[PDB]
Design a protein around this ligand. Sequence first.
Ligand SMILES: [Ca+2]
Length: 555
Amino acid sequence: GAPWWKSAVFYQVYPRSFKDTNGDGIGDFKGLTEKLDYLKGLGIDAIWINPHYASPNTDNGYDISDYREVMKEYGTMEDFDRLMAELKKRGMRLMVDVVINHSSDQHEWFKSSRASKDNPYRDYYFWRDGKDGHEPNNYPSFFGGSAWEKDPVTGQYYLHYFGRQQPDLNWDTPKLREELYAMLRFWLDKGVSGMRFDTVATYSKTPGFPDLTPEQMKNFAEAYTQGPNLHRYLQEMHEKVFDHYDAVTAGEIFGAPLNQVPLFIDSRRKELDMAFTFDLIRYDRALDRWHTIPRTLADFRQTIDKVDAIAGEYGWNTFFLGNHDNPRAVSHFGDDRPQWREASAKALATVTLTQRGTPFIFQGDELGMTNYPFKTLQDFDDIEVKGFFQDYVETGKATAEELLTNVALTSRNNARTPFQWDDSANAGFTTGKPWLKVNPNYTEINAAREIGDPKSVYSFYRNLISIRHETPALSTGSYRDIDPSNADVYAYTRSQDGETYLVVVNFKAEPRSFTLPDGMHIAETLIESSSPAAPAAGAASLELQPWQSGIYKVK
Ligand SMILES: [Ca+2]
């Protein structure tokens, strides 16, 4: 039998930018709770929320100062409990974000740890002497400069793969692991249905911390996933935690080669249930994670093919076209120009909700929200781009103008602009001043305008979700790309229990033709976007409008 999460449709809420209810410009728990009916009406089964714990917000939640307290900005523990209860009343499930590769430098564990060399919290983190007057080794950080930061109190350096205020936790210390396990139980005991593990592949560090080779240096993310005890630790966490609950686990597998992924998600291995990979979402990103590289539909579909393959029989993938760290789906994979935005957004919706795996819809993509028109430096404000300035502008590798030109297309802030609820002040997100500026296009792109319009992107998403829910093959069915080399039209089948469905999506802003495989004919049309007429029963080919998508039952 297949678990509930294989056929579930997930929705990612970024609480900071979802709904503000006290005018401070920051989204909160009360805001999310007020909007559960909206998400329920959309057809959402489960919600993944980004970190909601106590945090100095150097990385908007990903620097946690206390794992057993909620973030002051979002509300109180009572607000969280109310959120939990209100989700339960609607039969909805909650997936929380788990950030245990690192903590905030303001966490009490680290305050104690850094205070001396001989305290019981010293080995909760990684402290090392520098060498040759410099850092312990040549480890660079993802968020700028060295991954080693010297502390004048002890004269040693502490490790941080990410922000300087995000010191890595030491999984080699059994006592630390037990603290994390107890922490997970704290939230699981409250009834949490899911856990998403932030940078799950970097938990294990390399013994002795030897220097990275020049080859390794070019893509150091990979080396950070080559910890010798990685899967040993993940298996222990399952044994001591997940094996005692009925929660689904998902891993942000960052930096790891696709061929390593089955080690995380093979159900027989008793590690994680689902994989978030970077292959598709970063398929057109350069190695520096800020430059863009031109790609076609052929690249797009072939990546999906590869990702689906490693899932195999015993593993499972998530599928997403957007998250909190990426440009908007329609801007990134579609055509966000005014005359093509809605059509392409619907086409991407069709793709999202007919992939093999568990789809995650990022907040606002169901409205067809786009990239933000960056202007000022302040618009880009984010710890990652700040690191890019440190590593690329200060070093003279690139000008500020060059960086911003590119980052405008790849900025994480593209996904973090306030959710657009209506056409009131700041799109009805807040009564005050939003922490990040609202996209000006909210006047024509907002929830209120699209709910009432049956032709909207929202209604199309809602119809697709309904269709996927009623059609097992669209979730747990097999997957087959009709023509991996085709760069114009995306076409594939989903099959289960003798029932085969055909998905055809035109990725061009021009009319295209599509011929069905030999011996395959249209039986029914389930749904289409931007199509003036459904195909006749028994059709062996389709005529596609620009950006037309469709789901067909075949015979
Ligand atoms: Ca607020």
